[PDB]
Amino acid sequence: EEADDDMGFGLFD
Numbered sequence: 505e506e507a508d509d510d511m512g513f514g515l516f517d
Contacts, residue, residue, distance in 0.1 A: 507516075
C-alpha cells in the first residue's frame, strides 16, 4: 500500500 507521504500516528498507525 502507498502511504510514504510523511504520515503515521493515532489514526491509521
